[PDB]
Amino acid sequence: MTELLFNKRLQVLVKERRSVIRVSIELQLPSSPVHRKDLVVRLTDDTDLYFLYNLIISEEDFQSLKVQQGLLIDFTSFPQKFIDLLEQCICEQDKENPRFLLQLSSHSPSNLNIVETNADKHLTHLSLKLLPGSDTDIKKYLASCLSSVKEEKQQLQQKLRKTEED
Amino acid sequence: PHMTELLFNKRLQVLVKSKDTDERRSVIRVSIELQLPKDLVVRLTDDTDLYFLYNLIISEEDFQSLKVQQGLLIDFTSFPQKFIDLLEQCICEQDKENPRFLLQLSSSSSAFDHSPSNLNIVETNADKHLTHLSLKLLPGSDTDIKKYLASCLSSVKEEKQQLQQKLRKTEE
C-alpha cells in the first residue's frame, strides 16, 4: 500500500556540481497505524546505481518540522506543498536565469534545500535532512528497481507480441 | 579499474542442506568469473530469491594453498576449466535416477551468525563415492549483494532498451 506521489528527474546543485537527480516521493504505512502514512523521500541516480539518499517523515516527525521551519500547512497538505516547490524548480531549471533552485549540501546526512533567489537575496522554502543510504538500503532499493524494470520489460514483450501479429 | 571476464554462468540442480533445515533440491545459478581488482570469483545465486548469495574470491596467491587443500596438480589458469568440466557432468546427470555426478551445498556449523557452506562436487557409483571438489563459500554480505543486484539492474535496463529499440522499428 505504497502510493507514488511524485517521481521525476531534477537539476540539482550538489555541494560543487550540477547533476540530474531522480527525486521520488511516496506514502507508506507507518510504524503505528494511528498516525497517517509515512512520507518517504528518495534521491537516486539513473546511472550511478550506488547513489542513494533517503528520508522517512512520519506524521509526528513533521510536527517538529512544521514549527522548526514555520510551516503554515498540515502534514496532510505537506506532500503537495513540497511537490509544488519541486514543480517550480522544474518549471525554472530550463530558464535563462533559474529563480528556484534545488540544492543538496553536505557518511553524514545532507540537506535538501529548495531556495528561491530574489536578486542577490535567497529565501529557503524547505530544508530536509537526507540520510546516505547504507549498503542495506541500496540493496533493498536495487531489488525494487529490478522488479519494476522486469515488469516494464514483460509489458514491452506483450506489446511486441501483439504488434507482431499485425 | 575493476575488470571482469565471464567464464561460466548456468543453472544447476543442487542438494541444499541449510543451517538447521532439512535437505532440499534447488536450482542454483553458478557463476565463475575472472576479475582484476587477478581473482577467480565463484558465486551462487538463486533466480527466485534476490537475497540469496554465497561467494568465494580466489586470488592467484590464494590458489597456492587451495590447490593443496583440494589435491590439485593444475595451474591457476586451468582450475576454471576443471571446475567447469565437473559442473557440466552434473548438468548431464541431473535428470537421471541416480546421478553419477551431483552438486551439494552443505552448511557448516558456526557458534556465531555467519555459517559458511561447502559446495561439494560428488561422484558416485553404487556404494562408492568420491568428492572431487569441496569449496568453502561464505554467505554474501549486503555489500556483495548490492554489487550483484547493481550488475543485474544494469543488464536488465540494457535489455529493456534493446527491446524498446526493436519495438520501435517493428512499430514503423
Side-chain angles (χ1 to χ4, degrees):
Chain A
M1 284 300 184
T2 66
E3 319 179 30
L4 178 64
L5 297 185
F6 176 101
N7 185 331
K8 301 196 176 66
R9 303 176 77 173
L10 286 95
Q11 297 286 358
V12 178
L13 279 165
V14 180
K15 188 60 152 51
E16 184 200 43
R17 76 183 192 271
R18 182 168 155 112
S19 52
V20 169
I21 301 297
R22 177 169 305 272
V23 173
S24 167
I25 297 181
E26 310 169 275
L27 284 162
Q28 71 180 21
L29 294 176
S31 314
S32 297
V34 59
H35 303 87
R36 295 192 182 271
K37 296 173 298 300
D38 292 340
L39 187 62
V40 190
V41 182
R42 187 179 304 107
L43 304 209
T44 61
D45 193 280
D46 287 353
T47 60
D48 192 334
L49 300 179
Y50 294 170
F51 184 81
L52 178 64
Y53 279 84
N54 52 25
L55 181 56
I56 303 183
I57 313 180
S58 69
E59 183 177 14
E60 61 162 284
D61 276 335
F62 172 84
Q63 261 300 327
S64 313
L65 200 72
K66 178 182 181 181
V67 191
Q68 294 176 13
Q69 306 179 38
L71 305 193
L72 309 162
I73 58 182
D74 194 356
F75 171 71
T76 292
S77 311
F78 174 68
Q80 189 53 64
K81 251 304 177 186
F82 184 12
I83 294 176
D84 290 342
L85 291 162
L86 292 168
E87 294 289 356
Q88 282 285 359
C89 287
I90 283 170
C91 173
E92 288 287 332
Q93 64 186 358
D94 289 319
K95 293 181 177 173
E96 171 190 333
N97 186 19
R99 220 169 45 70
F100 276 81
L101 278 27
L102 187 57
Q103 295 180 331
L104 192 63
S105 308
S106 176
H107 200 271
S108 70
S110 294
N111 301 283
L112 181 69
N113 310 312
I114 296 157
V115 183
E116 166 176 2
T117 71
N118 216 327
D120 61 335
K121 302 178 182 178
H122 295 357
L123 189 84
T124 293
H125 289 260
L126 185 60
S127 180
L128 296 170
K129 233 76 173 171
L130 295 189
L131 311 174
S134 68
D135 282 343
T136 298
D137 296 322
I138 307 171
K139 172 187 69 172
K140 290 170 180 170
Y141 181 66
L142 294 180
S144 71
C145 285
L146 277 161
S147 290
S148 53
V149 175
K150 274 161 183 172
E151 194 170 24
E152 305 185 3
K153 174 179 56 62
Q154 291 172 351
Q155 294 168 359
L156 286 175
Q157 275 160 351
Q158 293 191 31
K159 185 178 177 197
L160 183 58
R161 183 180 58 88
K162 296 162 187 171
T163 287
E164 279 187 326
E165 299 178 353
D166 305 348
Chain B
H2 188 97
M3 279 144 293
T4 65
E5 174 180 333
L6 177 47
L7 307 179
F8 184 93
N9 186 318
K10 298 227 276 195
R11 283 170 293 100
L12 276 92
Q13 302 184 351
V14 178
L15 306 165
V16 173
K17 180 153 188 55
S18 178
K19 183 172 184 172
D20 298 346
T21 302
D22 191 80
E23 193 170 18
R24 180 178 60 262
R25 202 146 181 275
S26 311
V27 183
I28 293 294
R29 179 161 304 275
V30 175
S31 170
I32 305 171
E33 302 183 351
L34 284 178
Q35 291 179 358
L36 267 177
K38 37 176 166 296
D39 290 328
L40 192 70
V41 180
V42 182
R43 196 187 75 238
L44 307 187
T45 53
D46 187 324
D47 288 346
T48 63
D49 176 7
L50 292 191
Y51 290 170
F52 181 94
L53 182 39
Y54 280 84
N55 78 322
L56 174 61
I57 301 180
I58 305 162
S59 75
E60 216 176 337
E61 293 80 7
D62 290 334
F63 186 71
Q64 258 201 17
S65 47
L66 186 62
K67 70 194 292 192
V68 168
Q69 291 170 324
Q70 298 295 314
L72 296 174
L73 296 173
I74 59 181
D75 74 290
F76 182 71
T77 69
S78 302
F79 175 64
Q81 195 36 70
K82 185 213 181 58
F83 191 2
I84 296 170
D85 184 18
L86 285 161
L87 288 173
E88 307 285 16
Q89 304 308 302
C90 289
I91 299 177
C92 292
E93 293 287 311
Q94 75 185 14
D95 291 339
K96 305 196 171 174
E97 302 184 35
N98 195 22
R100 293 171 70 177
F101 281 88
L102 64 299
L103 196 53
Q104 297 175 344
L105 190 68
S106 311
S107 177
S108 66
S109 67
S110 174
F112 312 95
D113 286 330
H114 304 289
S115 288
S117 284
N118 298 311
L119 181 73
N120 309 322
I121 296 169
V122 177
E123 169 174 23
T124 66
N125 178 33
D127 49 306
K128 302 296 185 175
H129 82 67
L130 173 56
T131 296
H132 286 266
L133 220 53
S134 181
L135 305 176
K136 193 178 181 197
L137 319 178
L138 296 167
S141 61
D142 280 8
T143 305
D144 291 310
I145 299 174
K146 176 197 68 174
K147 295 176 182 175
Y148 181 62
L149 296 183
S151 294
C152 292
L153 183 55
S154 298
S155 289
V156 177
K157 288 164 67 178
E158 170 198 316
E159 171 93 353
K160 200 190 77 172
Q161 180 179 353
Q162 289 157 359
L163 178 60
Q164 278 168 328
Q165 173 168 346
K166 170 194 187 164
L167 182 58
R168 278 222 47 172
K169 182 177 179 179
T170 305
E171 181 70 15
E172 297 179 346

